[PDB]
Amino acid sequence: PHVKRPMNAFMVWAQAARRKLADQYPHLHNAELSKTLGKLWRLLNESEKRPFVEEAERLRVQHKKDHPDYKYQPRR
DNA sequence: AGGCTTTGTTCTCCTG
DNA sequence: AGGAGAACAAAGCCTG
């Protein structure tokens, strides 16, 4: 068994945004989508980012509670 | 199976 | 010393 990383603010926000974007732009692939998502992300300010920042932090805390002895060991 | 693409978090290396 | 560099979370498509 090999766990995986908790989502950060950007990833949490991109779940529902990618979706809405893919609707609007069916002809686009996730590569291109991601570029548009980037710009849309940095277009937000503190207040607009806060809920996802908070959401990434509770997700983060939960990950530690779920996996106490976890340690991130990326591959080479 | 793994690349393409993004941000943010966390890892593994270390020269002068 | 701390930071450059890269992995890896999400998505779904798509050759040989």
From Swiss-Prot:
Cell compartment(s), UniProt: Nucleus
Source taxon at top rank: Eukaryota
Coiled-coil regions listed in the entry: none
Tissue expression notes: Expressed in the intestinal epithelium (at protein level). Expressed in progenitor cells in various organs, including chondroprogenitors, osteoprogenitors and preadipocytes, but is not expressed in most differentiated cell types such as osteoblasts and adipocytes, with the exception of chondrocytes. Highly expressed in developing chondrogenic tissues. Also expressed in some non-chondrogenic tissues such as notochord, otic vesicle and neural tube.
The entry's DNA-binding region: 3-71
Subunit annotation: Homodimer; homodimerization is required for activity. Interacts (via C-terminus) with ZNF219; forming a complex that binds to the COL2A1 promoter and activates COL2A1 expression. Interacts with DDRGK1. Interacts with EP300/p300. Interacts with beta-catenin (CTNNB1); inhibiting CTNNB1 activity by competing with the binding sites of TCF/LEF within CTNNB1.
Protein's name according to its UniProt entry: Transcription factor SOX-9
Organism: Mus musculus
